Symmetry: C3
């Protein structure tokens, strides 16, 4: 595929995974550096949550790079897919943390937060099961199950969180609205890329798909974190 | 075994797993529908916890149905068991949530809740290790270890929780007592079914065992949830 | 290696793993017995956290003993390592609980606790990835990644926690300082033993390495717990 086989193991996508690891590590250390002498109780909570997002993603990217984070799945057809399963390990912790950032900005109640986290975790685990599934009936049923969970996530974000956020100051509202729009646009790309990529129809090859996830991830983690942590809205 | 090989993959138990998935999904969506316009802070907490119970079980059942949620374990004897390991993934999240429902009804302290959840999770993980174990000495030692944890769970329920629940109103007490009795009776069946079924002595075949877990699960999740969520006791 | 092949499966290290299991179980039950009639809210929290530490370790040790908790990893060189991966499952829950004990003694803020737990969990997961990795470049990169996380853990302990602990009474301070010194000394041994043992350079054989982890674990769990739970500092 598109890329460069950095480790001489026949995976040109490692170019994008190695770039991804580097960008996540630089983002992590930049947020740590920025957060270093912050005293405000509220601000340090946003820094703690947000540093761990690209920090966790750094490890997932590095595992994918080295190769332990990819597995072969032999489909009913006999097609062998290379499934980067470490992505789901990453998202299972980072997607709840990103939602937690939004929930803290909105100052929503604890039940809403628990609801969001639970439904989002369900989305990720069912997405992982789908990626590992051997039959096309099972793979697409899971994508559908996970996609429904995603829709509940978007729903609570654009109703419950947004209405809580409405009660805050204009500066908090501005930051919340920008980050919620970034989430609604960027996160929607994931189930689309999955279904057109190697996981699904195979119209996008692994190399391009890996580059595309790397861009979405870095924007969703380091971009989102930069916009959040630079904000007066803390 | 007893059932009907829905997917033509040689597993007659998929009849009961497919029925299980459907019943969990209907229960999930019925609780979501019932909870939709609920405003009371306390009530919505019970709805959030309880919807996720059959929701998580829906996914475990569907994984078992399709087949990814079963694995072959080759015993020291040479007997190959078909172990539905996805059950333990389900119970690890749903059993703590069901206990959390009871702890909220009783209004027990946070230390008691943490204790319950930790011991219950230990029960489930050691049950999973036992199900996957190759030697009869190991399988029965784990069943014993997990059974001891279960006894601590029952113990805290029937002492700490029940004494906290005694302080609430008759209507709260009535609901707590009914659900605690349902837990003490239904949950006790699980280690029994395990030890007489394919996991253990093999006196009950997989088909009947799968139907029996499906009945216990639906009653323990959708039954328990219906009794809880219909209650004034919120 | 050094030891005695208790289960006749060619693993002399099971002598130390069986001793480890017994010592963890006795520690668990001694803390349960000691904690049985304790009413003080604060004290029971320390008992709940601390009993679960050797309780969880009991299960990991027993899994290692029986053999399910060891796996073969075939390195790029062709060397087959026997990796006791169940240790990482243990540490992922027990290391956060031990830190939680220290954080409660110091009465540090909730952000600090979340930070500690997250970084410590990252340390353990990256240590597990390293232990399972096939190439020497990957194994040592992970040891380095995990070691950096460990350094953040030590850092927050010896700055944030210690400065919070300074505000408490002499008796609380004395207990906190003793346990923090035990953590700084004992936990530092783990990455050292890993890099000189089978996981790393192979200068220490598996038998001696298993005995060495058993001593460190029992001291770090039952020793630490005995010093904590005997203390007026609750
Ligand atoms: C493994 C690795 C490094 C991982 C390091 C991590 C994840 C560091 C996390 C630090 C955090 C989250 C800081 C929280 C602070 C908050 C102050 C506090 C209350 C915690 O004292 C602050 C200064 C505001 O960011 C690299 C390879
Ligand atoms: C994947 C799938 C669907 C999963 C959907 C789930 C799990 C929905 C959960 C909704 C919850 C828990 C609602 C909480 C509310 C509480 C209101 C709130 C405070 C959250 O705003 C309410 C209305 C009281 O139930 C199907 C296949
Ligand atoms: C599986 C197995 C046994 C596991 C048993 C466990 C882990 C027991 C935990 C008990 C705890 C943690 C007690 C908390 C109490 C606190 C009182 C409370 C508030 C909970 O009511 C107390 C009395 C202070 O320790 C053996 C093999
Ligand atoms: C590891 C856990 C303790 C953490 C929880 C992860 C969980 C949320 C995700 C489930 C993992 C699941 C997808 C694995 C299933 C893959 C399966 C098909 C088998 C392939 O595995 C092959 C073997 C080596 O030959 O590796 C076996 C590999 C191991 C199963 C684990 C390696 C997984 C990733 C490489 C980890 C990268 C993610 C981050 C490091 C997460 C750490 C964050 C921390 C703060 C919790
Ligand atoms: C998946 C995790 C991130 C979630 C935590 C699960 C954890 C509590 C339970 C441990 C799982 C463990 C029993 C797996 C061990 C099985 C092992 C013998 C190997 C067999 O696995 C084979 C490969 C495919 O060839 O699948 C490999 C399959 C994968 C290991 C995972 C699939 C597990 C189940 C099919 C998942 C169904 C349960 C629900 C979807 C849980 C989601 C709830 C959510 C809110 C967390
Ligand atoms: C089990 C989970 C629900 C709990 C979370 C554990 C998690 C934090 C750690 C990740 C586990 C990961 C290291 C496993 C990767 C090993 C992999 C290379 C494959 C080898 O596995 C082989 C199969 C059997 O043939 O066993 C497959 C074995 C299974 C994957 C699981 C067995 C793991 C250990 C033997 C468990 C011992 C630890 C304690 C029992 C933990 C319980 C504490 C509780 C309160 C949560
Ligand atoms: C390859 C092999 C066959 C499979 C690997 C096994 C994997 C799947 C095991 C991973 C299991 C892991 C995901 C367990 C989940 C753990 C998640 C948590 C412990 C989060 C819970 C944290 C709560 C306890 C915090 C509560 C917060 C309070 C303060 C309100
Ligand atoms: C840092 C990573 C982020 C923000 C990842 C977001 C990922 C998702 C929203 C994944 C969604 C998926 C579905 C809706 C269906 C199945 C495929 C999944 C996991 C990709
Ligand atoms: C929805 C599922 C429920 C309520 C499941 C409950 C399961 C248990 C109480 C399992 C108990 C077990 C033991 C006590 C010993 C080993 C076998 C286990 C897991 C089945
Ligand atoms: C009860 C167990 C305890 C207190 C275990 C502590 C383990 C560690 C501090 C492990 C540290 C490691 C590194 C710093 C690098 C990689 C090897 C690890 C896991 C051993």
């Amino acid at each position: 595929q598109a890329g460069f086989d950095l480790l001489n193991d026949g995976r040109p996508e490692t170019l994008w995974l190695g770039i991804g690891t580097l960008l996540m590590l630089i983002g992590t250390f930049y947020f740590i550096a920025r957060g270093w002498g912050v005293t405000d109780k509220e601000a340090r909570e946003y820094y703690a949550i947000t540093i761990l997002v690209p920090g966790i993603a750094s490890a997932a990217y590095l595992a994918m790079f080295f190769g332990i984070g990819v597995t072969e799945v032999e489909l009913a057809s006999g097609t062998v897919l290379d499934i980067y399963y470490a992505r789901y390990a990453d998202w299972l912790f980072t997607t709840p943390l990103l939602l937690l950032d939004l929930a803290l900005l909105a100052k929503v109640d604890r039940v809403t937060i628990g609801t969001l986290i639970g439904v989002d975790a369900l989305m990720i685990v069912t997405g992982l099961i789908g990626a590992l599934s051997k039959t096309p009936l099972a793979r697409y049923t899971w994508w559908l199950f996970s996609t429904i969970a995603f829709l509940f996530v978007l729903y609570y974000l654009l109703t419950s969180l947004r209405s809580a956020a409405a009660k805050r100051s204009e500066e908090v509202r501005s930051t919340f609205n920008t980050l919620t729009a970034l989430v609604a646009v960027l996160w929607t790309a994931y189930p689309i890329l999955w279904i057109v990529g190697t996981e699904g129809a195979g119209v996008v090859g692994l190399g391009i798909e890996t580059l595309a996830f790397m861009v979405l991830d870095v924007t969703a983690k380091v971009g989102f974190g930069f916009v959040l942590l630079r904000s007066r809205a803390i």
